Design a protein around this ligand. Structure first.
Ligand SMILES: O=C(NCCCN1CCN(c2ccccc2)CC1)n1c(=O)[nH]c2ccc(-c3cccnc3)cc21
Ligand SMILES: O=C(NCCCN1CCN(c2ccccc2)CC1)n1c(=O)[nH]c2ccc(-c3cccnc3)cc21
Lengths: 361, 358
């Protein structure tokens, strides 16, 4: 149930009874106005709304609730609390019209921009993003992957449209968990997840025993695209994307093929040597960025860095400098407030991850 | 070896010793001029050129040759001869500076347009291609699939970009055989072929025991797109594409899933009723066109029409009318010159496929 009403200016106000996303189940009376759509697609609509009291903007994600099982994205978002993941404020059920069908409404944080839109403005104007921002956005993405992976949860759809940005504060928040799943060893998972251009090679080869290192592949593809100004592995079909990977990574050995898809899909590729990564990027591209990519875009899934090991990479050393500032002069966002959960994959890395000036009493 | 030279007006002329495509290996001296790149991508470059002895335009596809095996696309082109398939006129090998790497060059026919660019012109102008042209193109596409399927060959990349058009003559020619493979029962094949928007469901579910009916699915996707003015099953991911398919066809039954990919990817889909096909298209969309789409876009790969059965669909009856003509006044191109090879899937169909007046 929801109660539609209005104000003196006919401004029109919706009031629902929602459950808070985190914390104990204490229903809340939430009133919002100025509902406008911000793109639909597949799952359903994603609306923007203004909360009547605080005036804060929020997002509402309206999808159709299956009456059999509870919604998997709901169950994951409720376990998550991290500064680089879009927060689930409230959720409530409703019905559009008659239908006899129930809708699930996820009330999330609003963030004005996406990496996709930002990187597209620079690419249209024949330029690239300032490396300080590429460091800041990549770091916060790797932080969010390290957090969700600590729970065994794989995003399975890392792409620039899923990376929200506050331009003022340089904050990045991972969004869209409608494909995320907990990966349990020995259970099979569908291989048709993840968007084209960002799918790991084991996904293209149809493997169903893939681990969380697919997200790291994807992130490596986001980084290279910020550096190149265009997708590094484009293609309208599996075969085309493989060709563009071979061009960069070289032909995969019989051993590397086994690590990806042990089924061996029974295909023979043209034998091309390894493109020296330094020849892939612009001349002034920082060597440490090229180093990070090569360690993320690996054939062998287990040879790829983990998210936590990526943050500790020398490419992010400038972020650990005590004097680092945003170009507009503000302080950087929270970068070093790691929890025990985040660090659980490798707690000794906090000797690098937490810089000395951050542990000053 | 290729001998670069010039004419006497300052034009630049290339002369190679090439092997005719469809014949005994007996190389000739071919010369051409006016080399223009018309697009590359993945495989390599695709030029356009003019034969010095006839001024005929030709396409040259240039790929890199693996010294291990022979090129699979060359081996297929040499066995194909159909009026709705781009002919391989000659082929020859060449280099390019040092490299120590050999390039294969396929001299193919030139056709000035594609179904993609023509479609895109009507879409941008908020019109739909007139149904006569949708019939003509779809029909010749199905003849070309009926032919190649009769050799057990699957194209595996049926999309509008690969459907060449001569606009004056209304001739369509299939092209790009760089993913084509003969499909033998019991041998597996890679599931990562075929462009997005046009991939059959068993491909999205990663099956490797698929048959030629993947091309028929792709064909129906072309048909729906020409009717609608945009792709029917868009999506940047397999999940996104399957949702668009569930929207139209309804939730696949546990039976239909086993027929597609018996492994069962292990996924649960939302339960959506079948969208009545007549509510997918514009109001004035011919019911026969909708009827043919429903028989091409089937979950069960064996429930789909074969290319030859689709040629005999009532949607193409106007093409077998003795008085049909093109909108520009010319006669329709070859449509009924079937061969035994082409009809071998189902010879009884000749009494429909070849009208009394041909
Ligand atoms: O997309 C989110 N902001 C994007 C804002 C970017 N412009 C969009 C609207 N406008 C514009 C658009 C087009 C042209 C011109 C102007 C101005 C800013 N989101 C949030 O702010 N909170 C979210 C929570 C979940 C999801 C989401 C995304 C995908 C799948 N599932 C959930 C998205 C957001
Ligand atoms: O595309 C073929 N005509 C299409 C011609 C259309 N242009 C003309 C216009 N425009 C352009 C206009 C102005 C400036 C720049 C460009 C480019 C496209 N082809 C033929 O005519 N013969 C073929 C044989 C093989 C293949 C092929 C393609 C891909 C993979 N493998 C084989 C294609 C053709």
């Amino acid at each position: 149930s929801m109660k539609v009403s209005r104000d003196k200016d006919g401004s029109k106000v919706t009031t629902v009874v929602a459950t808070p996303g985190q914390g104990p189940d204490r229903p809340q009376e939430v009133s919002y106005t100025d509902t406008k759509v911000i793109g639909n697609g597949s799952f359903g609509v994603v609306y923007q709304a203004k909360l009547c009291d605080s005036g804060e903007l929020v997002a509402i994600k309206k999808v159709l609730q299956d009456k059999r099982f509870k919604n998997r994205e709901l169950q994951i978002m409720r376990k998550l609390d991290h500064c680089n993941i879009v927060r689930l404020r409230y959720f409530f059920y409703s019905s559009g019209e008659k239908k006899d069908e129930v809708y699930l409404n996820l009330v999330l944080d609003y963030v004005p921009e996406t990496v996709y839109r930002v990187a597209r403005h620079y690419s249209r104007a024949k330029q690239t993003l300032p490396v300080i921002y590429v460091k800041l956005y990549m770091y916060q993405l790797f932080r969010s992957l390290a957090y969700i992976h600590s729970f065994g949860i794989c995003h399975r759809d890392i792409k620039p449209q899923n990376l929200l940005l506050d331009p003022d504060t340089a904050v990045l928040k991972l969004c869209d968990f409608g494909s995320a799943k907990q990966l349990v060893r020995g259970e099979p998972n569908v291989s048709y997840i993840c968007s084209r251009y960002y799918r790991a090679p084991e996904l293209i080869f149809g493997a169903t025993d893939y681990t969380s290192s697919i997200d790291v592949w994807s992130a490596g593809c986001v980084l290279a695209e910020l550096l190149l100004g265009q997708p590094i592995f484009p293609g309208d079909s599996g075969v085309d994307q493989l060709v563009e990977i071979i061009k960069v990574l070289g032909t995969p050995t019989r051993e590397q093929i086994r690590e990806m898809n042990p089924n061996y899909t029974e295909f023979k590729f043209p034998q091309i040597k390894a493109h020296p990564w330094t020849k892939v990027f612009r001349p002034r591209t920082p060597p440490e960025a090229i180093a990070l990519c090569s360690r993320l875009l690996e054939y062998t899934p287990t040879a790829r860095l983990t998210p936590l090991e990526a943050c500790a990479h020398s490419f992010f050393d400038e972020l650990r400098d005590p004097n680092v500032k945003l170009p507009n002069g503000r302080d950087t966002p929270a970068l070093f407030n790691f929890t025990t959960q985040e660090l659980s994959s490798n707690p000794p890395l906090a000797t690098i991850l937490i810089p000395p000036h951050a542990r000053i009493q």
